[PDB]
Amino acid sequence: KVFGRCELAAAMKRHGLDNYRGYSLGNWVCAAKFESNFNTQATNRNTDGSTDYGILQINSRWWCNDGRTPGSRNLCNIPCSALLSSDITASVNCAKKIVSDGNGMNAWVAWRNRCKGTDVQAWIRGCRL
Ligand code: NA
Protein backbone atom coordinates (compact mmCIF):
# COMPACT_ATOMS: atom_id res chain seq x y z
CA LYS A 1 0.00 0.00 0.00
CA VAL A 2 1.13 3.54 -0.83
CA PHE A 3 -0.23 5.80 1.95
CA GLY A 4 -1.23 9.41 1.67
CA ARG A 5 0.68 11.74 4.02
CA CYS A 6 -2.27 12.61 6.31
CA GLU A 7 -3.56 9.00 6.18
CA LEU A 8 -0.21 7.71 7.57
CA ALA A 9 -0.02 10.46 10.23
CA ALA A 10 -3.44 9.36 11.52
CA ALA A 11 -2.42 5.66 11.62
CA MET A 12 0.86 6.36 13.43
CA LYS A 13 -0.95 8.52 16.05
CA ARG A 14 -3.60 5.80 16.60
CA HIS A 15 -0.75 3.30 17.27
CA GLY A 16 0.80 5.62 19.90
CA LEU A 17 3.90 7.11 18.13
CA ASP A 18 3.10 10.82 18.82
CA ASN A 19 5.71 11.81 21.45
CA TYR A 20 6.86 8.22 21.91
CA ARG A 21 10.20 8.46 23.76
CA GLY A 22 9.94 12.25 23.18
CA TYR A 23 9.65 12.20 19.32
CA SER A 24 6.75 14.26 17.85
CA LEU A 25 4.56 12.85 15.08
CA GLY A 26 6.17 14.89 12.22
CA ASN A 27 9.47 13.07 12.94
CA TRP A 28 7.87 9.66 12.27
CA VAL A 29 6.10 10.89 9.06
CA CYS A 30 9.31 12.53 7.76
CA ALA A 31 11.29 9.30 8.45
CA ALA A 32 8.70 7.27 6.49
CA LYS A 33 8.78 9.71 3.53
CA PHE A 34 12.56 9.47 3.09
CA GLU A 35 12.91 5.75 4.04
CA SER A 36 10.09 4.30 1.83
CA ASN A 37 8.24 7.15 0.00
CA PHE A 38 5.20 6.01 2.11
CA ASN A 39 5.18 2.54 0.40
CA THR A 40 4.66 -0.49 2.68
CA GLN A 41 6.13 -2.79 -0.03
CA ALA A 42 9.60 -1.11 -0.18
CA THR A 43 12.67 -3.41 0.08
CA ASN A 44 16.35 -2.32 -0.17
CA ARG A 45 19.63 -4.32 0.04
CA ASN A 46 22.45 -3.08 2.33
CA THR A 47 26.20 -3.34 1.57
CA ASP A 48 26.67 -5.73 4.53
CA GLY A 49 24.29 -8.25 2.81
CA SER A 50 21.28 -7.54 5.01
CA THR A 51 18.03 -6.05 3.67
CA ASP A 52 15.69 -3.24 4.91
CA TYR A 53 11.86 -3.83 4.83
CA GLY A 54 8.62 -1.78 4.83
CA ILE A 55 7.41 1.73 5.74
CA LEU A 56 10.34 2.31 8.22
CA GLN A 57 13.01 0.15 6.46
CA ILE A 58 13.73 -2.24 9.40
CA ASN A 59 16.92 -4.35 9.08
CA SER A 60 17.33 -8.18 8.90
CA ARG A 61 20.73 -8.27 10.72
CA TRP A 62 19.21 -7.49 14.13
CA TRP A 63 15.41 -7.14 14.01
CA CYS A 64 13.60 -9.64 11.74
CA ASN A 65 14.29 -13.03 10.11
CA ASP A 66 14.47 -13.20 6.28
CA GLY A 67 16.28 -16.58 5.94
CA ARG A 68 19.29 -15.17 4.01
CA THR A 69 21.25 -13.00 6.52
CA PRO A 70 24.11 -15.03 8.13
CA GLY A 71 24.89 -14.51 11.81
CA SER A 72 21.77 -12.49 12.43
CA ARG A 73 19.30 -11.83 15.23
CA ASN A 74 15.52 -11.50 15.13
CA LEU A 75 14.89 -9.30 18.17
CA CYS A 76 11.30 -8.37 17.13
CA ASN A 77 10.53 -12.11 16.67
CA ILE A 78 8.92 -11.70 13.24
CA PRO A 79 9.44 -12.76 9.59
CA CYS A 80 10.67 -9.70 7.66
CA SER A 81 7.70 -10.19 5.23
CA ALA A 82 5.32 -9.14 8.06
CA LEU A 83 6.78 -5.62 7.69
CA LEU A 84 5.38 -5.29 4.12
CA SER A 85 1.71 -5.54 5.10
CA SER A 86 -0.86 -2.81 4.41
CA ASP A 87 -1.41 -3.14 8.21
CA ILE A 88 1.48 -1.29 9.91
CA THR A 89 1.03 -2.84 13.42
CA ALA A 90 4.17 -5.02 13.04
CA SER A 91 6.36 -2.13 11.80
CA VAL A 92 5.18 0.09 14.67
CA ASN A 93 5.74 -2.45 17.47
CA CYS A 94 9.25 -3.25 16.16
CA ALA A 95 10.06 0.52 15.82
CA LYS A 96 9.06 1.07 19.47
CA LYS A 97 11.70 -1.54 20.48
CA ILE A 98 14.41 0.05 18.28
CA VAL A 99 13.80 3.66 19.42
CA SER A 100 13.94 2.53 23.08
CA ASP A 101 17.44 1.05 22.67
CA GLY A 102 19.59 4.11 23.46
CA ASN A 103 20.49 5.90 20.17
CA GLY A 104 16.85 6.92 19.73
CA MET A 105 15.85 7.82 16.16
CA ASN A 106 19.55 8.07 15.08
CA ALA A 107 19.06 4.32 14.33
CA TRP A 108 17.31 5.50 11.08
CA VAL A 109 19.90 6.85 8.61
CA ALA A 110 17.29 8.79 6.59
CA TRP A 111 15.96 10.50 9.75
CA ARG A 112 19.45 11.64 10.81
CA ASN A 113 20.29 12.95 7.32
CA ARG A 114 17.04 14.52 6.08
CA CYS A 115 14.73 15.14 9.12
CA LYS A 116 16.85 15.87 12.27
CA GLY A 117 17.20 19.64 12.75
CA THR A 118 14.54 20.56 10.15
CA ASP A 119 10.96 21.83 10.53
CA VAL A 120 9.48 18.32 10.75
CA GLN A 121 6.10 19.85 11.79
CA ALA A 122 5.59 20.73 8.15
CA TRP A 123 5.05 16.99 7.43
CA ILE A 124 1.65 17.09 9.21
CA ARG A 125 0.47 20.52 7.94
CA GLY A 126 -3.16 20.55 6.71
CA CYS A 127 -3.95 17.20 8.36
CA ARG A 128 -7.04 16.86 10.57
CA LEU A 129 -5.57 14.93 13.53
NA1 NA B 1 17.91 -11.79 11.03
mmCIF file of C-alpha atoms in Angstrom, residues 61-103:
data_model
loop_
_atom_site.group_PDB
_atom_site.id
_atom_site.type_symbol
_atom_site.label_atom_id
_atom_site.label_comp_id
_atom_site.label_asym_id
_atom_site.label_seq_id
_atom_site.Cartn_x
_atom_site.Cartn_y
_atom_site.Cartn_z
ATOM 1 C CA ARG A 61 20.730 -8.268 10.717
ATOM 2 C CA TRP A 62 19.212 -7.494 14.132
ATOM 3 C CA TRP A 63 15.414 -7.143 14.011
ATOM 4 C CA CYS A 64 13.598 -9.643 11.744
ATOM 5 C CA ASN A 65 14.288 -13.033 10.108
ATOM 6 C CA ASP A 66 14.471 -13.197 6.276
ATOM 7 C CA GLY A 67 16.282 -16.575 5.941
ATOM 8 C CA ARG A 68 19.293 -15.173 4.012
ATOM 9 C CA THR A 69 21.251 -13.004 6.524
ATOM 10 C CA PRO A 70 24.113 -15.033 8.134
ATOM 11 C CA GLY A 71 24.891 -14.507 11.812
ATOM 12 C CA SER A 72 21.767 -12.494 12.432
ATOM 13 C CA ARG A 73 19.299 -11.833 15.230
ATOM 14 C CA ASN A 74 15.522 -11.500 15.131
ATOM 15 C CA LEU A 75 14.890 -9.301 18.168
ATOM 16 C CA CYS A 76 11.304 -8.374 17.126
ATOM 17 C CA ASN A 77 10.534 -12.111 16.668
ATOM 18 C CA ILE A 78 8.921 -11.698 13.242
ATOM 19 C CA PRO A 79 9.439 -12.756 9.587
ATOM 20 C CA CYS A 80 10.668 -9.699 7.658
ATOM 21 C CA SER A 81 7.703 -10.191 5.228
ATOM 22 C CA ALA A 82 5.317 -9.141 8.056
ATOM 23 C CA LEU A 83 6.778 -5.623 7.692
ATOM 24 C CA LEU A 84 5.378 -5.286 4.117
ATOM 25 C CA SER A 85 1.711 -5.542 5.100
ATOM 26 C CA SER A 86 -0.856 -2.808 4.408
ATOM 27 C CA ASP A 87 -1.410 -3.143 8.213
ATOM 28 C CA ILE A 88 1.485 -1.287 9.912
ATOM 29 C CA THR A 89 1.032 -2.841 13.425
ATOM 30 C CA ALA A 90 4.165 -5.021 13.040
ATOM 31 C CA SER A 91 6.360 -2.128 11.799
ATOM 32 C CA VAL A 92 5.184 0.092 14.668
ATOM 33 C CA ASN A 93 5.742 -2.455 17.469
ATOM 34 C CA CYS A 94 9.247 -3.251 16.159
ATOM 35 C CA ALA A 95 10.065 0.517 15.815
ATOM 36 C CA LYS A 96 9.061 1.068 19.473
ATOM 37 C CA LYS A 97 11.702 -1.541 20.484
ATOM 38 C CA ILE A 98 14.411 0.051 18.275
ATOM 39 C CA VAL A 99 13.803 3.658 19.419
ATOM 40 C CA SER A 100 13.941 2.531 23.084
ATOM 41 C CA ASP A 101 17.435 1.047 22.669
ATOM 42 C CA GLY A 102 19.587 4.115 23.464
ATOM 43 C CA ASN A 103 20.488 5.896 20.166
#
